[PDB]
Amino acid sequence: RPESELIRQSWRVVSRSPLEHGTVLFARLFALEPSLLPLFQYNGRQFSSPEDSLSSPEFLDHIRKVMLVIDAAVTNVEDLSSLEEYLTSLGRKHRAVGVRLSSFSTVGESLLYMLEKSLGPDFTPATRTAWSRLYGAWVQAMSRGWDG
């Protein structure tokens, strides 16, 4: 695993300011799949527009949480067996919140977007494919929360 090094290396750029970078991730997500917006219901209110989410302390705390789970998957990039149980649970919580499993493919595209934009010239097709591999394994794990 040298592609493990490619993940470890790229992530370090992004980990320096996780809320900045997570903000790009979720802005892109809403641009591709606007129907995700109502699933963030804090105090029983719905955001009207994507920009409304960026003022919400609870939504910004969710971005921090997301970046923490990714950082965990990176730390255990060599063996993802050790997060499997936690990820099944995380999946079930999201099934319960109303997230469809198909929407996690959008998430993966939004992560690769955010990496591409952050790393520019450094984001080689080798690293695109490493991250695709990792994320596909990560979603495989989460997928059990929808049974399977």
Ligand code: HEM
């Ligand atoms: C695809 C769209 C997503 C939506 C709509 C969504 C929505 C939510 C909502 C509504 C909650 C409960 C409220 C909260 O704690 O803020 C939640 C919790 C959480 N989400 Fe997400 N989420 C998504 C993706 C992700 C992803 C990709 C990750 C991680 C990589 C993640 C990590 C978390 C964590 C760690 C929690 C707290 C779970 C717990 O321990 O109870 N979420 N999400």
